[PDB]
C-alpha cells in the first residue's frame, strides 16, 4: 500500500498551494490521522526542507502544530504534520460568512498571541490569512493554531537581534487580499506587516468581504494593482464604518509602526479585551460554531 516514511498511508488530497499539495494520512502504528505535505523534488526552488526547520524551531509553542516526520521519497520531499481541525475560513463559510463580534474578539486575542510568538522566535510569517489559522482537536478545540511557514523568514539575527535591512522594489509576497500597504509598495516585510494583515482579516470577519475583493481584471498583475490602489484609496475609517473604533485604531497603529519597531502586542490585545468587557461578553470560548 502507498506510504510515505514507511509509516504513513497516503489518503485523498485535502488542499493545494504554491509550496506543495496537502494530503490526509494515517499513521499505521497508532491509526492517528495526520496531514502530509508533498513538494516535488524537481521544483525550481526547494522550500519544504526550510519550512520543516522553521516548524522544528517553533515546537513547544502554544498553537504550533507538531511535525512528526520529514524526509525525501521518490519524486517528493515529504513533511508529515499533526492533523488539526477546520480552518477559520472553513468555519467562516460554515457560518454563512457571519461571525459575531464576540467570536471575532476571542479569535483576535489568540491570533495576536500566535503572531507575537513567531516574532519572539525571530521570524515573520508573511502569509497571515484565514486559511492559515486552524482550530485544535478534541480538548484543544478552543485553541487557534497557526500554520504554513512556507513564506516565513528571519527578520532579526538570533544572537544580536540586529534587524534585517530596509529595502524597496520588492515583489509582492503573500496574498493580494490581506497584504499590507507597505507590501503593495514593494517594501521589505517586517513585524508590523503580519499585524496589519491580521487587521484586514478581522475586518474581513466583520464584513463578510473586503472592498478590494472580487475586482474584475484581465492579466493577473493588473488585478494586483487594482487591488493595491483600491486598498490605498479606501481610508481605514471608511473600511471600518459600522464597527467599533477599536478596529480602526488597531489598523492605524500597525500602519504607524516603523520598519524595525517592536509592536506593542499587549496594547493591541488590550484594545479588544476592553471592548470585549464593554459588550458584556463572557470568556467562555463559546464561538458562533
Amino acid at each position: 500500500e502507498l506510504r510515505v516514511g514507511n509509516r504513513y498511508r497516503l489518503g485523498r488530497k485535502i488542499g493545494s498551494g504554491s509550496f506543495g499539495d496537502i494530503y490526509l494520512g494515517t499513521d499505521i502504528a497508532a491509526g492517528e490521522e495526520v496531514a502530509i505535505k508533498l513538494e516535488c523534488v524537481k521544483t525550481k526552488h526547494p522550500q519544504l526542507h526550510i519550512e520543516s526547520k522553521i516548524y522544528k524551531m517553533m515546537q513547544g509553542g502554544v498553537g504550533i502544530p507538531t511535525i512528526r516526520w520529514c524526509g525525501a521519497e521518490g519524486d517528493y520531499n515529504v513533511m508529515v504534520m499533526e492533523l488539526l481541525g477546520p480552518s477559520l475560513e472553513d468555519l467562516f463559510n460554515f457560518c454563512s460568512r457571519k461571525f459575531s463580534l464576540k467570536t471575532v474578539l476571542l479569535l483576535a486575542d489568540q491570533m495576536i498571541s500566535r503572531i507575537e510568538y513567531i516574532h519572539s522566535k525571530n521570524f515573520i510569517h508573511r502569509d497571515v490569512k484565514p486559511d492559515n489559522f486552524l482550530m485544535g482537536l478534541g480538548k484543544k478545540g478552543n485553541l487557534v493554531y497557526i500554520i504554513d511557514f512556507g513564506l516565513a523568514k528571519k527578520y532579526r539575527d538570533a544572537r544580536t537581534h540586529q534587524h534585517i535591512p530596509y529595502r524597496e522594489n520588492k515583489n509582492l509576497t503573500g496574498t493580494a487580499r490581506y497584504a499590507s500597504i507597505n507590501t503593495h509598495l514593494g517594501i521589505e516585510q517586517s513585524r508590523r506587516d503580519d499585524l496589519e494583515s491580521l487587521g484586514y482579516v478581522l475586518m474581513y470577519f466583520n464584513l463578510g468581504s473586503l472592498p478590494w475583493q472580487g475586482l474584475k481584471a484581465a492579466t493577473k498583475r493588473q488585478k494586483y494593482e487594482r487591488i493595491s490602489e483600491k486598498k490605498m484609496s479606501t481610508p481605514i475609517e471608511v473600511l471600518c464604518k459600522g464597527y467599533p473604533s477599536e478596529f480602526a485604531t488597531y489598523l492605524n497603529f500597525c500602519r504607524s509602526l516603523r520598519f524595525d519597531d517592536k509592536p506593542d502586542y499587549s496594547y493591541l490585545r488590550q484594545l479588544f479585551r476592553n471592548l470585549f468587557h464593554r459588550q458584556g461578553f463572557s470568556y467562555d470560548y463559546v464561538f458562533d460554531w
Binding site: 498551494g17 490569512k129 515583489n171 496574498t175 493580494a176 487580499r177 472580487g214
Partner: peptide, 6 residues
C-alpha cells in the same frame, strides 16, 4: 487574489 506569492 488569495493565491500565495513568492
Amino acid at each position: 487574489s488569495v493565491a500565495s506569492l513568492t
